């Protein structure tokens, strides 16, 4: 990712130095009222909103590289009461208070473009994943976060596409579906397996009908086509 | 809108002239090679897909003042096959090709912030409305819409808050086109006196109630909005 390369250079030489987190760990947490511009270099995250009862709303998954802002450049106060959170089992990503932010972006306009691409991707993405919910229900979503791993993490191996994560869990995989509760996940991945569309072997799953999830996301299937031409070309 | 009227009057010193479209007309499609910044200044609007059987899904709504994207600032190219339909009677825009926004926006850093800021206010608003559908389904995205009537267009009067748009765009916006779930919603709440019909007019009578199911765009409208949502909180 060349840009990004870019733009972590760019980091380095303006003083600001990676920090590695692990898994469980919150980057940035929904009750402090500093913000901040994460640049995910590395890793997986997904951002979080804790209610009071506790429960952890699942709202979006990041990988690395990308960018992650929790607070409005402009104002600088908070854009939504978020935790980001690390799920895998480290994480690289460089921290600028959001206050030093539009200074960097200021003097850099090629790094500016590339921090607002990555809202534009997020924007998009989001739209996307709704679309295919709302017409395809809970089978798009599942379909639809396969799809993405399947391109992004797929191996091609004799038992099908594996899609190459350490602990990628069923209940992990509906939350990044919208999915809360594991009976929905079990019925859907139940129907994929019983269709042979995917399978799980060695803690991992396989996936051996691609175009049937291509079928069932056709708009997040477009975003990945429109965002990351790259990377849908290698399964296309 | 301060920072949005200085954003026009920037556009118009660079030489951009404002456009008028009508009802149902589209600022951008989804077959045009060419992609755009849209200045919308005044009126509704919505975005809209097409599936292949030529059903029209409705994504998301935008008023005037506000920025739409279609394409990457980087690579220029299309960020989803949406078209730009207009829902008020005439809406007013401003017609940017992508490539000409960076130098504008190189320029005049103000202004690079406002469109920033915009687009995080729209990646803020997706999660918000997402995480509501994700508590109360349905009946969160419903009160989520209305919430914004509210907000956008309320102000308090004895018979409750008066939403203050025609008769006409307000039965679109409070909504695939005309399912029968939502319809049955919307009475449900009208039956329960959260709006009221009175002389002609929709009043808001029960704030609470839409709050209480739509709490995660209400904060939004709260961090994003502050000054809006003050008025009628
Ligand atoms: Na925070
Ligand atoms: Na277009
Ligand atoms: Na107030």
Known sequence: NAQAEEFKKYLETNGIKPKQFHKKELIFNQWDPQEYCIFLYDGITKLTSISENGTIMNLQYYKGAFVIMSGFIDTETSVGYYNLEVISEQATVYVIKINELKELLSKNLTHFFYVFQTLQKQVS????????????????????????????????????????????????????????????????????????????????????????????????????????????????
């Open 125 to 236: 993405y989001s739209l996307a994943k709704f679309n295919d919910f709302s017409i395809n229900g809970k089978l798009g979503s599942i379909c639809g976060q396969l799809l993405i791993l399947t391109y992004v993490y797929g191996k091609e191996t004799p038992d099908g596409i594996k899609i190459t994560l350490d602990n990628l869990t069923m209940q992990e995989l509906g939350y990044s579906s919208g999915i809360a509760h594991s009976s929905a996940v079990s019925r859907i991945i139940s129907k994929l397996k019983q269709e042979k569309v995917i399978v799980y072997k060695n803690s991992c799953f396989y996936v051996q009908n691609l175009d049937y999830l291509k079928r069932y996301a056709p708009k997040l299937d477009e975003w990945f086509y429109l965002a990351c031409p790259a990377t849908w070309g290698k399964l296309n």
